[PDB]
Amino acid sequence: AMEDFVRQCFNPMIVELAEKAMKEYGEDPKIETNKFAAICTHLEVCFMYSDFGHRFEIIEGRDRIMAWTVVNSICNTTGVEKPKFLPDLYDYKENRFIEIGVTRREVHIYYLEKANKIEKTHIHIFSFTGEEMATKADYTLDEESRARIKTRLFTIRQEMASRSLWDSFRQSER
């Protein structure tokens, strides 16, 4: 049901990407259906964000070799410190990496988790409630761009609840 929902309600390209991010590292998407669903959602957000500008480099959804190649190439030509972990985007207009959070919980809680896990990386957090949080409250995008994202997340939430899948999903976050 959760799997059916994922395959039915997300772009093939994204489902194909989500499944590799799992299947290389040994997780089965037929069993960790909620993680599957989550990874897809996070990918979709990253792509959506990436599209609404060529302002943004998409670093998520690549294999490790490509991502670090892309990160190194950005660091050689801009001078910006190289982060320890792969973030999700780079913003060529503000000249900072971005880490994208999607949370079923409250935004400040997921913000702190991420902020603690890392330093000059801009953090942006979306919830399924149309709530967002971002370092220095600098939300990077225009409101229209941030509304498409919020709608889309909320839509996913509402589709999940149609199929009685939201409650499971909500509770399987850290």
Ligand SMILES: O=C(O)c1[nH]c(-c2cccc(-c3nnn[nH]3)c2)cc(=O)c1O
């Ligand atoms: O596409 C990725 O690179 C990716 N995204 C995620 C990811 C992103 C957002 C949420 C979650 C998640 N939700 N619930 N459990 N994990 C997982 C995890 C990975 O291990 C991963 O390799």
Ligand SMILES: O=C(O)c1[nH]c(-c2cccc(-c3nnn[nH]3)c2)cc(=O)c1O
């Ligand atoms: O691999 C990543 O790039 C990645 N991984 C994660 C990730 C990895 C493991 C667990 C979780 C998680 N558990 N609950 N919520 N998120 C999230 C989140 C991201 O936003 C992200 O960009």
Ligand SMILES: [Mn+2]
């Ligand atoms: Mn990432």
Ligand SMILES: [Mn+2]
């Ligand atoms: Mn992220």
